[PDB]
Every structure is written in structure tokens, then in C-alpha cells.
Amino acid sequence: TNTKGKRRGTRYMFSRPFRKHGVVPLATYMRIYKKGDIVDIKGMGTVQKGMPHKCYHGKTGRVYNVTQHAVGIVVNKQVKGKILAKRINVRIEHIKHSKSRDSFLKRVKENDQKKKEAKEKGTWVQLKRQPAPPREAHFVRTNGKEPELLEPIPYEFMA
Amino acid sequence: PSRLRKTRKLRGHVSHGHGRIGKHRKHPGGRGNAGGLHHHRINFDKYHPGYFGKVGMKHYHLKRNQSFCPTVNLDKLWTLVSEQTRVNAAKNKTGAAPIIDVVRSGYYKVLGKGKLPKQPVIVKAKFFSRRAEEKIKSVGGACVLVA
Amino acid sequence: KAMSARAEAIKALVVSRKLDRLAYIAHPKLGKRARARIAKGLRLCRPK
Amino acid sequence: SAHLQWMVVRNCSSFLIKRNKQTYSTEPNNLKARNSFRYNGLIHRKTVGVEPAADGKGVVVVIKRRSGQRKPATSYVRTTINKNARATLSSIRHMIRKNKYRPDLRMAAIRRASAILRSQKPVMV
Amino acid sequence: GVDIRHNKDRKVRRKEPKSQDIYLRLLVKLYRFLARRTNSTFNQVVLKRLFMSRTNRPPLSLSRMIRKMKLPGRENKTAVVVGTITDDVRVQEVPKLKVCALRVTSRARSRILRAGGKILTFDQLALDSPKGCGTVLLSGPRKGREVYRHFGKAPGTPHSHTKPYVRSKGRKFERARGRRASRGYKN
Amino acid sequence: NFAELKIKRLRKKFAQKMLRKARRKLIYEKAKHYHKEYRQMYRTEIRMARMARKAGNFYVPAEPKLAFVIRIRGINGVSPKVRKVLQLLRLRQIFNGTFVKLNKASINMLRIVEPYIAWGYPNLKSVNELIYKRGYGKINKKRIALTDNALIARSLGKYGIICMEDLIHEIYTVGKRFKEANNFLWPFKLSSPRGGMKKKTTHFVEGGDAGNREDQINRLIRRMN
RNA sequence: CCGACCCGUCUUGAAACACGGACCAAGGAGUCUAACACGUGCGCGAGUCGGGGGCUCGCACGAAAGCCGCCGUGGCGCAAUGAAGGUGAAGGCCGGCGCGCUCGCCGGCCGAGGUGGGAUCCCGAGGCCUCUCCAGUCCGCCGAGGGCGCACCACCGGCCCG
Ligand SMILES: [Mg+2]
Ligand SMILES: [Mg+2]
Ligand SMILES: [Mg+2]
Ligand SMILES: [Mg+2]
Numbered sequence A: 001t002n003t004k005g006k007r008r009g010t011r012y013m014f015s016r017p018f019r020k021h022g023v024v025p026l027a028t029y030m031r032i033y034k035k036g037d038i039v040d041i042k043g044m045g046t047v048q049k050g051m052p053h054k055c056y057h058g059k060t061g062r063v064y065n066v067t068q069h070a071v072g073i074v075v076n077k078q079v080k081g082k083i084l085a086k087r088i089n090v091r092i093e094h095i096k097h098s099k100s101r102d103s104f105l106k107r108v109k110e111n112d113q114k115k116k117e118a119k120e121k122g123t124w125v126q127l128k129r130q131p132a133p134p135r136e137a138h139f140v141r142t143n144g145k146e147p148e149l150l151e152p153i154p155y156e157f158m159a
Numbered sequence B: 001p002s003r004l005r006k007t008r009k010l011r012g013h014v015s016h017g018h019g020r021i022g023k024h025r026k027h028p029g030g031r032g033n034a035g036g037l038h039h040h041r042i043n044f045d046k047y048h049p050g051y052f053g054k055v056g057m058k059h060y061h062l063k064r065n066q067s068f069c070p071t072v073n074l075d076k077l078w079t080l081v082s083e084q085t086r087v088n089a090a091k092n093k094t095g096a097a098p099i100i101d102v103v104r105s106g107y108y109k110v111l112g113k114g115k116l117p118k119q120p121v122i123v124k125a126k127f128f129s130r131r132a133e134e135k136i137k138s139v140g141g142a143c144v145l146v147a
Numbered sequence C: 001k002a003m004s005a006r007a008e009a010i011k012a013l014v015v016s017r018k019l020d021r022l023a024y025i026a027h028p029k030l031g032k033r034a035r036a037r038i039a040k041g042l043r044l045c046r047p048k
Numbered sequence D: 001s002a003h004l005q006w007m008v009v010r011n012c013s014s015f016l017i018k019r020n021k022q023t024y025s026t027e028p029n030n031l032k033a034r035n036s037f038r039y040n041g042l043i044h045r046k047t048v049g050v051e052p053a054a055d056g057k058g059v060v061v062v063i064k065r066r067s068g069q070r071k072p073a074t075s076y077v078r079t080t081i082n083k084n085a086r087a088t089l090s091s092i093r094h095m096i097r098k099n100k101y102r103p104d105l106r107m108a109a110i111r112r113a114s115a116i117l118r119s120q121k122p123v124m125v
Numbered sequence E: 001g002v003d004i005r006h007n008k009d010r011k012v013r014r015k016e017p018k019s020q021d022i023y024l025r026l027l028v029k030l031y032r033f034l035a036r037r038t039n040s041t042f043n044q045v046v047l048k049r050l051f052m053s054r055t056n057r058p059p060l061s062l063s064r065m066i067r068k069m070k071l072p073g074r075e076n077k078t079a080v081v082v083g084t085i086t087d088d089v090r091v092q093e094v095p096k097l098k099v100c101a102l103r104v105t106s107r108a109r110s111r112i113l114r115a116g117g118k119i120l121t122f123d124q125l126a127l128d129s130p131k132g133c134g135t136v137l138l139s140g141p142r143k144g145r146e147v148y149r150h151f152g153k154a155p156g157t158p159h160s161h162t163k164p165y166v167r168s169k170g171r172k173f174e175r176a177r178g179r180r181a182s183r184g185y186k187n
Numbered sequence F: 001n002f003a004e005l006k007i008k009r010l011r012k013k014f015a016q017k018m019l020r021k022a023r024r025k026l027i028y029e030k031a032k033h034y035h036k037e038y039r040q041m042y043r044t045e046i047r048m049a050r051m052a053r054k055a056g057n058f059y060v061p062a063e064p065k066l067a068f069v070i071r072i073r074g075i076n077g078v079s080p081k082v083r084k085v086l087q088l089l090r091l092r093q094i095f096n097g098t099f100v101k102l103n104k105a106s107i108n109m110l111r112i113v114e115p116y117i118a119w120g121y122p123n124l125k126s127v128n129e130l131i132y133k134r135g136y137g138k139i140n141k142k143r144i145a146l147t148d149n150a151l152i153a154r155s156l157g158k159y160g161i162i163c164m165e166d167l168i169h170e171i172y173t174v175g176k177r178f179k180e181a182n183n184f185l186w187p188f189k190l191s192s193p194r195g196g197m198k199k200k201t202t203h204f205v206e207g208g209d210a211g212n213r214e215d216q217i218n219r220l221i222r223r224m225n
Numbered sequence G: 001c002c003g004a005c006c007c008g009u010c011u012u013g014a015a016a017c018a019c020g021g022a023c024c025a026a027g028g029a030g031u032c033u034a035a036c037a038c039g040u041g042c043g044c045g046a047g048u049c050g051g052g053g054g055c056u057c058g059c060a061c062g063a064a065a066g067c068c069g070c071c072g073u074g075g076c077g078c079a080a081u082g083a084a085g086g087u088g089a090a091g092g093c094c095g096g097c098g099c100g101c102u103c104g105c106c107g108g109c110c111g112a113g114g115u116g117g118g119a120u121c122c123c124g125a126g127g128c129c130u131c132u133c134c135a136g137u138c139c140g141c142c143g144a145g146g147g148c149g150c151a152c153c154a155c156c157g158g159c160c161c162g
């Protein structure tokens, strides 16, 4: 009974945020998108050309083709019980770079620098980041102040 | 051998391997290629594209003999003569080249797939491909036509 | 030329610890002579 | 060869008896009378066989000569052994072990000869 | 109870040849012993190839074997294939080859022998190189068969080039609707 | 030539026996050193608490790095996330046990399957009893009982673990090679709790058995194996 | 003593106030042909197949079996593509020349290109040997790296037809 319109249910998702309507900021156009980098699809409603479908809003893909105004993105879509990597054409207004990739690459650069420096100075260093370890033993100074005693409060109907 | 068949293993099973719900009925869905455009359309579209319609000119009284022109490639060309011919031509001091008549072998057109050994040869054929002719000329051979 | 330059650059040279000692002896190869020595010591008895 | 003929007759043979979840072989030179490659008395280039003598006393030990493999008339040499039990078994042991003539059939022939010798003497009352 | 799915416990693989060929079973016995009592993985590969069906043992042409032996460093090595050596009349010169194969075509065998070559059965190979040392294990084109032109994505789907099953080939046989844009669609 | 081959066999046998003796002596000394280390740890906790109490302050012990997780519910009607996690904990049958190294990832992972497990912080005696009574090794995909030290040595000797005592040291003190030592052990096939249960369907803090009983897991272990 | 509703069937659900069944014996229901498709076994293998005909004391079996080869006509395969007229599947390297102009004329070789994987195989520094060594003799094993890379997969090239 649901219609199959290309924008059904997109009343809020493609809408502009509050007091962010109007002219699209230009810095979204001077971004450089090479092939093989990671982008996040947004799909603003100000530019109706080259919009992605509602099933790609919020998904993350990899750019495989660059054109005059848009890019080609390989993005995974789940259909029933299979993941097929769809290729979509999205204009650059609706995408932005993924900061997870940038954080990973800067971690790689730091790791390589750390390896070079450690092989210089001989002493081993840790690279594989660890999950939050259990806290080690420590002392808690009272500083001559008795810890405050707490009772539960009496009940009273306030509202 | 009926003793090796699946019926001998289905004795005692009431449905005989055809299910209790849907059963085995006479012809659910039609007989033969019934409903190729209505309810078996997905199967025909998916596995037999192009099945429905007319394409091209219809020609009454086609005679298959008229267009009979079997072909032979260049790589299999030297198999039409005995190896004695090949070695005699290869070791020959003079420039004499053997003559291979493919019509005698039952082939009418000489196609150009493959490459030839570098030794001259005369090929008697009804039709020649352009690249076949070029490859025969490149090894110093010659092409002649027969009717 | 890059292979030659890099290759000529590369070739351009110039306690007791009882548990540790026991782990050294217990090695099948590093501790062969040690256990041979202790076997000879346990076998032969000599004065002084 | 022995292996090839075995693959031929391991399941299709007139001497094969398949009954009561058991298998037996009835060719003349089969000690233990079992259907097995080791004990088969036809496929091997050399075999031994212990049978009772024609008269009801002593055993006959048949062995296969190397020369006439395709010559079944003279391929088998039979010697009749009609001595006491210990001497008979010692003679069979010497025939098999000293000649190295199939040492894997030594105890088989010893046991079969013992069984035949006990079958030969009169039963108790 | 215990929480394991049991639908994949029974691995499907050839533990023995389906054939009743007594010679094949004999050399299967030989290479079973060789693979069990040696550390050579070549014996394992040969043994598991002897189990394979005929479609899994495609014939090896003479030309392909010559081409593979002619690669650098494979001089004076034994070419081993579990299958049939097949003559290729498209090749004219045959070098000296030392080949072990399950079967050799009479014409291919004649060409190999007249070229000064040697042909070994697998028992002869076992006597020669029991570990398979100095051998080049080859295989024929496994997907060189007509059935694989029909296998793949369905013919009536976009971007599929798989051969449909037709009783005859001609302009009247599955070429109109779904094959050209002039009749409905093309995909 | 019989004499020199006899001498060869005698020398090879003697060398093998001397190697065996040296390895046994190493095992003995390592167990002694582990005993010393354990009593140092146990007395150190007491001493730290005592000096903090002398100063009038509070000594917060390091929260434990090792946990023992026991699956207490069956395999019927389990949600897919819980089932997947229990498969990841190697707890695929009721009353299995597994030593789980504690960190943020493992703690959240245990929080997911909280109604289905009962876990806590084992002491040394629980570890010794577990490894010695129900210790089975996954040696070449086979549940092999740890009856000889050679079984541990062949599979884990590359990590320095060559005996029962070394394995217990890597389990109790969560060592550098804890992952290999713990995955080497088959999940423990604990029996039913003798003396019964309080209630398996509610949390421990509300009178039941599910969830984290922080040191009372040792009582369950004693009644369990 | 404990447990224990009548089977078959349709059904979400049958002991059902749902239908068939009083009892017993015998009979009683996925077959054959044709055409495909895939898998497996066998023979030969760029071939293969005599199935129709013919030749062999005409016939117990034998209406079988054997053979034909200038009986392979023919079928399937070995070449595709186009509605059709028709056309119809080999490149790489080193060169001298125009003007080595994004190409035209020849040489010499090689003989279906290349990339990433790739079972297998090959080389292999270095190790393992004994009553000990300074001294090298023959072969075995482990072995870091390296090399040729089957089939097959992904990709990029190349060739034929419209
Ligand atoms: Mg809404
Ligand atoms: Mg059933
Ligand atoms: Mg229905
Ligand atoms: Mg069970």
C-alpha cells in the first residue's frame, strides 16, 4: 500500500537544519575527491540534482569515479539476505569526507614514525592499541575529612 | 534397471516424494509451454530472451546446398597433406612448394586463424579470407582460385 | 643506476640466575655439554 | 600378477562362500580357508598347502615350483609326511622357514597340520 | 543439549575413485601408500587427482604441455598429468619430452616417441621419483567444456553473456523480444 | 659391528634420559618460584591494605584482570545476539566454564549475556582445581585430557608454557600469552551444582544466580566440579 | 505397580461430536517411449559414431556374434557474427628509413600478451650427525629467502562479426 515514490518518507531527512537554509556554503565545492577515498553520503534538499536515493543517506562508501560535478561511489546496500555493492552517482553537495579514514591514516603515519624512531633507539614500544584495561591499585587520601554520610530522603508529594 | 531407482526407496512413504500439501496433481500451471507470456513469463524472460516475435526476412524454399561452403583455418591447413609432403617441401634444396587443394579435402573457404610455418605453399581454394591471403603471402606462398 | 647506487651505499661499511641457568641446561642443543658435564661429575669421583 | 588377479577374484570366484556374515574360500591351497590376498592359494607365484594323505594317516605338503607358472599339470610338488606329530611339524617348519618359502604362512601350516593330525587318530569313547 | 549446527559436519569429497577399474585401483593403492609414508605433498595431490571424475580430469593437449615445459627453468623435468595426453595437430615441432600420464593418445604417443621422448606410467614414475622430485605437475583446462558457456548469470538478465539452451541456432530462435531494443527491450 | 652400534644406542638413550632429568628439574624449580610469587602477591595485598589503614586512608585494590564465566541456562529460545556471544565465549552448553580476560570489550560482551551466565573472580585454588580435575587440551581439534606435561609442552612450548604449573601461572596471572593458553584449554565440562541453586532466572543481587557474583563464584566452583 | 485416548488423512490445530475403516485372504497405484539438462562410469579422442545397408554353412543357442573403410553418405564437434548482401578470429622484441608524423616498406628471431594471487616443482645461505679434534671426502633431513609457475579467479590489453 506504500507508494514507491523516490522521495517517500523523506520529509525530515532531506530537509535543511534549523536556520541553515539558503545558499550552500562554497567550501563543500572546493573539496578534493580522489578515487579510492571514503565519503559519507548526506543528501541535502537545497540541490535537487544528483541526489542519492533515501536508502543511501547516512551510508559510507568509496569513490571510484570523478566527473565534472559529481563522483561515483561504491556503497554497500543490504537487500534481503545479501550485501551487494551498488555504484551510484552523487553530486558533491551531498557527500563529505569520512574522518574515520583520516584518523586511521594519521595513526598509520604515527605508527611508522614510532617504528623508525624505536629501531633507532632500540627500545621496544607498543603499537597495537589495547582496550580499556582494568584500573590498577591506588590509595585514596582522606585528608582528615570524614567521608560524608548519606541517607535516602523522606517521601513527600510535590507535584 | 528399476531396482536402482528412487521408487524402490519410497515404498511406505504415503506421498511418494511429492508432498502432503501441494500433492502431485495432473497439470498445475498448464500443459507444455502454456502461459509463456502470462504466468510463466518470468522463466521465459530469464532463461529464453528473444523467444517471442519475428526478426529478419523470411525466405521460402531455402536450399542448404546452395550456401554449402565449409571452412578450414590456416593452422590446420598442413594436416590436409601427408607428413611426407611436408618434410619433402621443408628439406628441399630448391624453392619448390607443394600444392594443397582444400576442395579435394572437402573445404571451400580458407580462413585465417592461426599462423603458418615459414615455408612456401600453393593453396587451391574457392574462397580466401583477406588475412588468410596475407598470411599465405607472408611465408612466400601463393593463393589460386578454383571453380 | 639506482640499484648500483643503493647497493654501493649498503656495502659501504666502515650472575648465577638459577632458574635461567636451568632453562639453559634444559635446552636440547644449548645445554648438551652442560648435562654431559654433570653426568660425568656424578659418575667419577676424584680426590682433591 | 598376484595383485591384479586378486582384484579380479576378490569378490567374484567359484571358491568364494559368503554366508552368515562370514566369508570363506575353498581353493585347494588356502590355509585357514579364508578369502584373503595373503592366504589365497591360486594368485601367488609360490604357495603351500597341507592336506590329509590319501590313506587316513599323515599329511601331504604341496608347494608351488617357480618354473611352470602357466603349466598347472607340473606346477605343484607334493610330498607325503607320515611321521610322528612333533617330527612332522618340525619337517613342515623346516620346509617353510629354512627355504624362506613364504615365511608368512608358517604358523598357518603348523596349525593346519596339527588339526589334521588330531583329526586322523581315533576318537575317544 | 549442545548448540552446534550439524549441516556441515560431513565434508563432501572423493575418498576413493567411483570407477571399478582394477588397474586404477591398483595405482590408487600404490599412491595411497606413498602419500601416507612420505612427506611429499606431490603424492597427496596425485592421489587426490586419481579420485577425480572424468570432467575433473580434463585432457591435456600436446601443445599446452609443450608450452608449459618450454617455460624457463623447466628443462629436463618430468611432465606429470593425471589424465589423457591428447595430440594437437596445430603444433608442428615436438621437442624431447619426458611425460607421465594416465593415458596417451596413439597419435600423440607416436609423435612423442618419434621426437625422442619418453612416456612413463605412474608406477614407472613412482619407481623413478617416489617423492615427485624434478617433476612439473600439469592439468588440462578444467573449464574448457561446453557446459560452462551455459553456467553463470541467467541469459535474460543484464550484463550476462551466457549461452542459452536452444535446439537450433538461427534468426528465428530466441532473437526477438529481450534481445534487441526494436522489440521491447534488450538488457 | 654389533659393539659400536650397541654403544651408539646406549649413548643415545643416556642422553635422552639426561635431557628428561634436566627438564624435570626445570619444572620443579619453576613450580617453586611460582609458589614464591603467589605468596608474595597475597601478602602484598594485605600489606598495602594495612599501611593504608595505618595512615587512615583507603586502599582500592586493582580490580581483577581474570574472570570465570559459567553458562547457567540452556540452549532453548535464545536470542541471536546472546547466542552469538555465547558461541564467542565457547559456552555452547549449560554448565560450561571459561576463563575470560577482563577489559572493556570483554566486560561489555559479558553484560550482553548477563541473564545467561554466572561469573566472578576466581582465586588461585579454583584455578588449580579446575585445571587439575577438568583440564582438557584442544590438541589438534581433539579434547585430550592433560595427563602428561608433554601434551602441554608440544602445543604451547613455543610460548614458554611447558607444564601444568606454567599453564596455571599464565591463567591466574593473566600473562602475555594468555590468549593462546586459554584457547588451548577446552571449555570446562562442569557438573550440576551440588546442593542446588538459588534461582537461575534472576540476577545474583536480587537473590538469584545470574550475573556477577564477584568473589562468590568460588563457592559455586567448589560445589560445581 | 507405573505409564498409557484409534489408526489413516486434510489441517495453524484431531482422541475428537471431522471424514474412511465390521473381520480375513488374494489383487492394488511414479511405468514405458521420445526429447532435453546436469552428474557419474567406460572406450576412443580433434575426432567420434554404422544406428541404415551389405558380406560371412541362413536359422539349436544365432532375430545373436564377427567384419566392411573408395559403405563415414550422414549426425554431433572442430568458428563466429549480421535481418541480409556478406564478412570471418596472432602478437611481442631488437632495428635501420619517410618525418619511426601515434604510422607506411622490409629484416631477424620468438610463437596467443601483461598484472595480483596460485597447489606442485626447482635453487637455496645456514643447521642436525658419532670417543674429540686442525682435514676434506659421498650421499639424507630442517631451512630464512629466491625462482619457474598448472588449473582456476579478478583485472588490463589484443583479435573476428554487426
Ligand atoms: Mg517519521
Ligand atoms: Mg519422511
Ligand atoms: Mg496450498
Ligand atoms: Mg547429546
Ligand SMILES: [Mg+2]
Residues within 6 Å of the ligand: E006
Ligand atoms: Mg539434526
Ligand SMILES: [Mg+2]
Residues within 6 Å of the ligand: F076, F077
Ligand atoms: Mg524457556
Ligand SMILES: [Mg+2]
Residues within 6 Å of the ligand: none
Ligand atoms: Mg542430596
Ligand SMILES: [Mg+2]
Residues within 6 Å of the ligand: none
Ligand atoms: Mg523467560
Ligand SMILES: [Mg+2]
Residues within 6 Å of the ligand: G009, G010
Ligand atoms: Mg482427509
Ligand SMILES: [Mg+2]
Residues within 6 Å of the ligand: G011
Ligand atoms: Mg479448519
Ligand SMILES: [Mg+2]
Residues within 6 Å of the ligand: G014
Ligand atoms: Mg488423527
Ligand SMILES: [Mg+2]
Residues within 6 Å of the ligand: G016, G017
Ligand atoms: Mg467434540
Ligand SMILES: [Mg+2]
Residues within 6 Å of the ligand: none
Ligand atoms: Mg458428519
Ligand SMILES: [Mg+2]
Residues within 6 Å of the ligand: G019
Ligand atoms: Mg472430506
Ligand SMILES: [Mg+2]
Residues within 6 Å of the ligand: none
Ligand atoms: Mg463408516
Ligand SMILES: [Mg+2]
Residues within 6 Å of the ligand: none
Ligand atoms: Mg471397506
Ligand SMILES: [Mg+2]
Residues within 6 Å of the ligand: G026
Ligand atoms: Mg496382498
Ligand SMILES: [Mg+2]
Residues within 6 Å of the ligand: none
Ligand atoms: Mg549383428
Ligand SMILES: [Mg+2]
Residues within 6 Å of the ligand: none
Ligand atoms: Mg561428409
Ligand SMILES: [Mg+2]
Residues within 6 Å of the ligand: none
Ligand atoms: Mg599468471
